[PDB]
Every structure is written in C-alpha cells, then in structure tokens.
Amino acid sequence: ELDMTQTPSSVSAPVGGSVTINCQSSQSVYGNNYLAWYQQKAGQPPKLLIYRASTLASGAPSRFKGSGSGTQFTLTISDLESDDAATYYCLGYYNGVINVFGGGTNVEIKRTVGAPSVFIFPPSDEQLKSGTASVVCLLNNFYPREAKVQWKVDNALQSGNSQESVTEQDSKDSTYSLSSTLTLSKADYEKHKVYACEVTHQGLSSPVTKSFNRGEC
Amino acid sequence: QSLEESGGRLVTPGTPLTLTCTVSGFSLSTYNIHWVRQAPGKGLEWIGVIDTGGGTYFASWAKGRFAISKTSSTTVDLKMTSLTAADTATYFCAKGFDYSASTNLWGPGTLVTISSASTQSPSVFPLTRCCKNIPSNATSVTLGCLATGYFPEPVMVTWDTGSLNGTTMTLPATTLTLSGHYATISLLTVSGAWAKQMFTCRVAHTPSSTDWVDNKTFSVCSR
Amino acid sequence: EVQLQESGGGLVQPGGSLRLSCAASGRTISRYAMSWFRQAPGKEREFVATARRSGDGAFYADSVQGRFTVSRDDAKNTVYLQMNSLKPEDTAVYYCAIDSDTFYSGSYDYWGQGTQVTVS
Incomplete structure (x- = not known):
C-alpha cells in the first residue's frame, strides 16, 4: 500500500x-x-x-x-x-x-568522450561442428554508453539474431565495454561470404566497420 | 563475524525450496536475521525478519508463502512455497540489530532460478581474430572465450597466461532468446610474446557439478 | 532538408577567444544532439564537443575540456561553441553535425560546410 x-x-x-x-x-x-x-x-x-x-x-x-x-x-x-x-x-x-x-x-x-576500439571474432571451427555459428563484435573502452551496432551479412542488414552485453562502468577509467553476438545456424553461415560489424558512436565522425571473409582468415 | 547463504538452485515452478543462512561470529539470541532478495537487473526487495524469540514478520506481497525458522544456534532457514518465475532472484540474509533492515553485515547471496529448463553445461569456444587482420607489429592482442548454452547462472572464467601479464574482463550474461540459456564472453588482453604463447581459459559451472571445469587451450594464430 | 551554416571563426592570438555558431534552417534541431568536429588539413577528423537535448548535458573531448564550452539556443535553431584559451594545436576547420539518432548513438548524417579557426 x-x-x-x-x-x-x-x-x-x-x-x-x-x-x-x-x-x-x-x-x-x-x-x-x-x-x-x-x-x-x-x-x-x-x-x-x-x-x-x-x-x-x-x-x-x-x-x-x-x-x-x-x-x-x-x-x-x-x-x-x-x-x-x-x-x-x-x-x-x-x-x-x-x-x-x-x-x-x-x-x-x-x-571525457572516448571512441570505442572495435574488434571482430569469426566463429571457431569447434563450434561449427555443432551446427551453430556465433560471430562476436567487441566495442572496447568507450564513453558515453550510447552506441549502435549493426550486422551486415553479404551487405544485408540483419534483424532479430543478435544480442548485446554491456559491462558496468569501470572503477578506474570510467569507460564501458560492449559485445554483440550474432547467432546463425551452420547452414546459414556457410551460404555467405562477407561478415561485417558496423559501429556508430558519438566520438566517431563516421561509422567504423570491421569485417572478414569466411575461410579467408 | 559473517553470514553465508546456501540452498539456491534450479527448481521447477511449484516446487518447495528451503534456503539456509549460516551465521558465524554473533549469536541469534542477540541479533535478528533479515531476508532480502533481488531479481536480475532489478532492485532490492525486503522479504521478512525473525527475531530472537522466534516471531516472524513479512512484507505485504509475501501472503504466507514465506516462512522463517531458527533451526540451530548458527543456522536460520527460509522456506518458500508457490514459486513461479518471478521469484528468480539472488537471496541475501543479513544480521539485524533491530526490526529495521539497516545493517552492515550481509551474506554474499545465493542464486535461485525458477524455470522448467534443464541444467545444461556450457560449451566453451575460443575467440581469436583473423590473423591477416592482426598487424605484424602489434605489441598487444585481445583474445577471448565464449561460454554459451548453459543454464542456470553462473559461470566463472579464469585465465592461465603463462609468463605473460594480462588483464581479464568478463561481460554480464545474456539470455539467449531461442533457448532461454545464458551466454558470457570473457576477454584477455596480453602484451609481449603472445605469438608463440598458449593461453587457457578455465570455465567452471557449479550448477552442473561442483567440480565441472572446462579448460580450452589455444593460441592467437594457428600458424 | 536542413542546412547547417557555421560562423564565427577566423584568426586569433594564442590565449584569445572565439565563439562559433551553427545555425540550422529547415528542421527543428531541438530534438537532436549537435556535435562539433575539427579537421586539420591532411589529418583525421576528430571529436571536439557535443550538446545533447536541453537537460541531457554536454560532453567534451579530452584535448578541449576546461577551455571550450558548448551550448544551445533552441528557439533560434542555433548551437554555440565558446572557445576560450586557444592553443596552436586548436588550428583546424571546425564542423557542425546533427546526431540524427535521438538516443545519442552518433548517427551523423547532416554536416555543415565548416569554418576556419587559426591560432598564431
């Protein structure tokens, strides 16, 4: 009451x-x-x-x-x-x-404003044996919290198959870190070539993109 | 002088569940014991209190589903009935000086999960970048481990870095939308001779078993 | 659509002051954050300052904090960059940009033509 x-x-x-x-x-x-x-x-x-x-x-x-x-x-x-x-x-x-x-x-x-450092991780060969492929995009050491992560699979914008995780604010440099995990099946993963992560932040003048090709590592 | 909770586990809805607050240091004939829970990502919520004489007083929303009992001189039990998914929370006990829940001595909390999903062990996969996309003059490198598909919380990732010094960072768990299981990413940033160094993440999952340990040993580049 | 026009640059002694203004015409910018950027000739475009919506604060770069102050006049569709205690490292063309995302994720679709700030 x-x-x-x-x-x-x-x-x-x-x-x-x-x-x-x-x-x-x-x-x-x-x-x-x-x-x-x-x-x-x-x-x-x-x-x-x-x-x-x-x-x-x-x-x-x-x-x-x-x-x-x-x-x-x-x-x-x-x-x-x-x-x-x-x-x-x-x-x-x-x-x-x-x-x-x-x-x-x-x-x-x-x-102060810090732009994120972006890294992309292709899925491991051990995970591909199990029928699932996770592609990981990491946003490292940025401030403020507000950023936007877009996945592109053969230039096609993804929707509904990604999840994000944000850490708490750091107790030393007061930054945030964020990871976005793109979850696809193994059959959907091996049908496409270019896997790109496009990151937008207020400290970046233009959206930064890190990408790889499947099998061309 | 401390408190510690035990008995938090995964149960189906409708299953009765008993937690135990084990106290060391102080006496329960002098001090009261509060019960406070906290849903994941949500705030603190008071449950009830037992006094030295054995009388229990609860919150308005409890509605007789919760009962507190003194079982020994060092243990206090909290019995919960009619559990649904809204009771998934980390449950704390605290040493109360009076009937107010204002105290500096709290337990670390035990995690209670109310779901109809199965106890699943995590799958651990290494996270390394494309080696052509790593610069040859890179003084430091970022690698990681993906522990995915486990239920319930938590996992614990520790790292073996060999002779190199590294900083570790574990992100909060995400609920996978299709299965309801959790997934985490632990990251390790080392400097030095990382090109020839083998790195190991040690992922422990105590809801599966108390000694469930997965060691994933890998390098940055498979040259 | 909306056009951004910067003004207020020019030549200034070290330790001097300048106030840049960026007038927007076409769309009401009270719903958008307005950011300042600078680019020396032959260098990368770097962040200077941002002014979010009124009540959501302002954020600054590390090189300019304590000397530069960003502000808004939402009735006139204009934001300002008051530049105090200018150094020779501040010599750049200063650009004005609209964050098209209302939740401040930095989607800079609209840009001004820039104004020259010279410190010597």
Whole structure:
C-alpha cells in the first residue's frame, strides 16, 4: 500500500562534482528518522552508508551525507571518485514492522568522450561442428554508453539474431565495454561470404566497420 | 563475524525450496536475521525478519508463502512455497540489530532460478581474430572465450597466461532468446610474446557439478 | 532538408577567444544532439564537443575540456561553441553535425560546410 519514491533513477556527475538522491515516503517512517542508505555494486551485497537518516556508518567515508526527517530524505555524495559508480538504495522502516526499499538510483561518473576500439571474432571451427555459428563484435573502452551496432551479412542488414552485453562502468577509467553476438545456424553461415560489424558512436565522425571473409582468415 | 547463504538452485515452478543462512561470529539470541532478495537487473526487495524469540514478520506481497525458522544456534532457514518465475532472484540474509533492515553485515547471496529448463553445461569456444587482420607489429592482442548454452547462472572464467601479464574482463550474461540459456564472453588482453604463447581459459559451472571445469587451450594464430 | 551554416571563426592570438555558431534552417534541431568536429588539413577528423537535448548535458573531448564550452539556443535553431584559451594545436576547420539518432548513438548524417579557426 505505502510507497517509497526514489528520484532520480539515473544521475551523472564528474570526478569532484556532487550528486543528490531523494527518497519520499507516502507515510512518515518509524520515529521520523528510521531511514537507511545503501551502496551496491555488481554481484555484491549492498553496503550500508547512512543509518537513522543522518548517522554515518562505520567504514563509510565522510563525503556521504544524509539528511531529512519524516517523509523527505536526501543523500548527498560530495567529492566524487570513480569508486562511487554504483547503484544506491534507500530503506525505510515503518510502524507495523515493515521495511520498504527505494527503487534505486544509478550514479554514473561523467568523463571525457572516448571512441570505442572495435574488434571482430569469426566463429571457431569447434563450434561449427555443432551446427551453430556465433560471430562476436567487441566495442572496447568507450564513453558515453550510447552506441549502435549493426550486422551486415553479404551487405544485408540483419534483424532479430543478435544480442548485446554491456559491462558496468569501470572503477578506474570510467569507460564501458560492449559485445554483440550474432547467432546463425551452420547452414546459414556457410551460404555467405562477407561478415561485417558496423559501429556508430558519438566520438566517431563516421561509422567504423570491421569485417572478414569466411575461410579467408 | 559473517553470514553465508546456501540452498539456491534450479527448481521447477511449484516446487518447495528451503534456503539456509549460516551465521558465524554473533549469536541469534542477540541479533535478528533479515531476508532480502533481488531479481536480475532489478532492485532490492525486503522479504521478512525473525527475531530472537522466534516471531516472524513479512512484507505485504509475501501472503504466507514465506516462512522463517531458527533451526540451530548458527543456522536460520527460509522456506518458500508457490514459486513461479518471478521469484528468480539472488537471496541475501543479513544480521539485524533491530526490526529495521539497516545493517552492515550481509551474506554474499545465493542464486535461485525458477524455470522448467534443464541444467545444461556450457560449451566453451575460443575467440581469436583473423590473423591477416592482426598487424605484424602489434605489441598487444585481445583474445577471448565464449561460454554459451548453459543454464542456470553462473559461470566463472579464469585465465592461465603463462609468463605473460594480462588483464581479464568478463561481460554480464545474456539470455539467449531461442533457448532461454545464458551466454558470457570473457576477454584477455596480453602484451609481449603472445605469438608463440598458449593461453587457457578455465570455465567452471557449479550448477552442473561442483567440480565441472572446462579448460580450452589455444593460441592467437594457428600458424 | 536542413542546412547547417557555421560562423564565427577566423584568426586569433594564442590565449584569445572565439565563439562559433551553427545555425540550422529547415528542421527543428531541438530534438537532436549537435556535435562539433575539427579537421586539420591532411589529418583525421576528430571529436571536439557535443550538446545533447536541453537537460541531457554536454560532453567534451579530452584535448578541449576546461577551455571550450558548448551550448544551445533552441528557439533560434542555433548551437554555440565558446572557445576560450586557444592553443596552436586548436588550428583546424571546425564542423557542425546533427546526431540524427535521438538516443545519442552518433548517427551523423547532416554536416555543415565548416569554418576556419587559426591560432598564431
């Protein structure tokens, strides 16, 4: 019934800048201050930063500052580092023994534009014995996240047979890496010759293409 | 002082499932135990809490499907019924000071998959570029391993680089659209004498068996 | 369709300032990100700055960060590149480009004719 509303869902700020994450509850929390803040990275349990709306947790740095009372709460992260690129949650405790997590806010570290390094991988001969061929296009070390990958099989634009994977933002150089996997059957793979991956990014003035011919490696 | 979850596995919908939070360091006659889950790519979600006296309080959406029980002085069980695919999540337990879920001591989490698919072992294939498309004066090279067609999560890829120093990078898993199985790409970037060096990726898949290991040994160029 | 016309270049001393403007006529560019590029004669075309839609921020190249500032006037279909603290390495023809993808993937289909910036 009751809501815990976390805004914004995404926010970007450079190293040394500041972010503000707000949590608004539909009903006042227990004792007007039972509100916590968490930091979570990929594959890890969340780490407590603030409890009781403003008390700093043991081991969290001083640059994490919480404030608020009642229904309106704010986490302020000043003096941003690349380590802080994570998803942050608020957690309110309520009368009736009820805990409600916030929706989450993704903090992205803003940096300079980096164009992606593109590599293409032909399918292995071991995979071709099993009747499936996967062609892999890698986009390495780029910022911002927004890029577009197009597959061309004998100059024909593919649709419906590719999937992408994006890493989390890097904790050192704040870049992303992306892989796109083109899945074809073995009979469809051996009917065609040219396999091209065309990559479009805001740091590239023109779309870059890396390609190979089947059997001509 | 730590917590660790166990019992997360792949089950069909409708199968009962019991997880176990094993605590070391603190006492359950002093501290409570929370249960928090998290769907893949989604946020944290509170389930319930057991106090020192044994009383359990849950969320509004639980609707009696979840039950928490103290089984020994170090173990706390979470029993789940009426499981569907929406319960596929990583389940954490946490040491609670009070009834609030504000705590700094969490388990690493165990992964629960609710599906009607079969436990399948990954197929590991090497990823090398066209050797004519690799420059002859290249000081570094990027190679990789494709572990595809496995279910459920996770796989673990480690690398043997020999005498060379390399940086590894594993991408998040993608759900294959036709089969529902997962696929990952682990990449290795080495510098130095990579032309004559043999490289091995070691792909482990604990849902198949605890010692399921695939070692794919290959070179950059098949000269 | 839409035509892009750059203006505001010319000769400047080291440490000087210039403001480039790129007026678009034909299509409303409030839905598109506008990027700046530069190309020295006989060199590759490299990235300078981008201005996304109002509220989505601006991003810069590493060689120009802290000195150049990109901005928009969406009512007049014009974006600006304020260039402060100019160096001799900044001497290039500066081009204006529309990102035709509204989700900022860099699909630069429309380009201006360029304007000359000389630092000496």
